[model samples]
Target: LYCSNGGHFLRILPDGTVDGTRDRSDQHIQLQLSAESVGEVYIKSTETGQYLAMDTDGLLYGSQTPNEECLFLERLEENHYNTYISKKHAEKNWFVGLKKNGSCKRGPRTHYGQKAILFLPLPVSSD
Candidate 1:
């Protein structure tokens, strides 16, 4: 599946500087998500199996277990898109955001009004 704001899709490579890629040839873009409370999810990349999550200080990387840090409360917008907010950072209203350069914005840096904070979740397959 795909969820990105701006240029490239939301993804993480196994290792190195190529964190979120603008290239589409790699199947690392495919994601796995299970249904959860009010759309909350601990999303995972089908390729690397690293769970997508955010930290308290706004770090965005995933090598996570099923924990509070792994959870994101997914909310649908009137425009048919979605906004993802970190469960741990809910009190501060931190969002999971991606930049045009393909790096994730630190949670505290993301704002609800910004275009980079908007996400449209797309299925990678028909299944």
Candidate 2:
């Protein structure tokens, strides 16, 4: 996952690409790529990441394509919350994901939700 060049959390697929922005607010789980207390989560560059900040009303912001943020979740069982890893490339201490314990419905279902935030780890130069 990754923040858009414009600073919005976004999801990146394998083969080095990004998944489009999701339409459902409930399915857009943001994760922290940087933190001040908890330390960075260990990411292998292959796992889907998460965003960290939430709006005063619970919406997500403060990052580009999920850069300072990223995707933290995908498919969750109803009423069950899961833990994901947060990536912090420039600092230590990351945060957790959104509270998705109330719904799990996909778009327009109000029940089965599928969340996916963007994550684009700083590209490692193999050159």
Candidate 3:
């Protein structure tokens, strides 16, 4: 999926790590979504078999097993897209964001903060 403000794509490295980059290739853009509960989901990488997870320190990575750190709450934005907030096992609100250079980071969920929020649904072929 593409990041709304950063114009980057989320990628799962071979080492089961996550990052956002400007690269638009298939491997850099593929993600699998699984419903964890109503209005919440788990985002897994098609290339790594790992789920997107966040740590207490606000780092974004991939996990082989499902856990609270892998759960995300999907919030509908006024722009008609969705913002993913980390459940992080019931921690405070942390939204996924792309750094100025396209790396991944976690930010607070205060103001929509477009830079920290993402836009979604694959822009390229799902397969």
lDDT of 2: 0.29
**Which residue segments of model 1 deviate by more than 4 Å?**
1-4, 16-18, 122-127
Model 2 misplaced stretches (Cα beyond 4 Å): 2-32, 39-52, 63-127
Query: What would the per-residue lDDT of candidate 1 be over residues 56-124, giving only the tens digit for each residue?
Result: 767666654656666777775645456777788889888767666656536787768766666666433
For all candidates in order, the CA lDDT equals: 0.62, 0.29, 0.63
Give Cα distance to truth, residue 68, candidate 3, Å: 1.2
Model 3: worst 10 consecutive residues (lDDT sum)? 118-127
Least well predicted 10-residue stretch by lDDT in candidate 2: 103-112
lDDT tens string, model 2, 37-105? 343332222234432322223233333344434333322222222223333311322223222332211
- In model 3, which regions exceed 4 Å deviation? 28-30, 107-111, 122-127
lDDT, candidate 1, at 29: 53
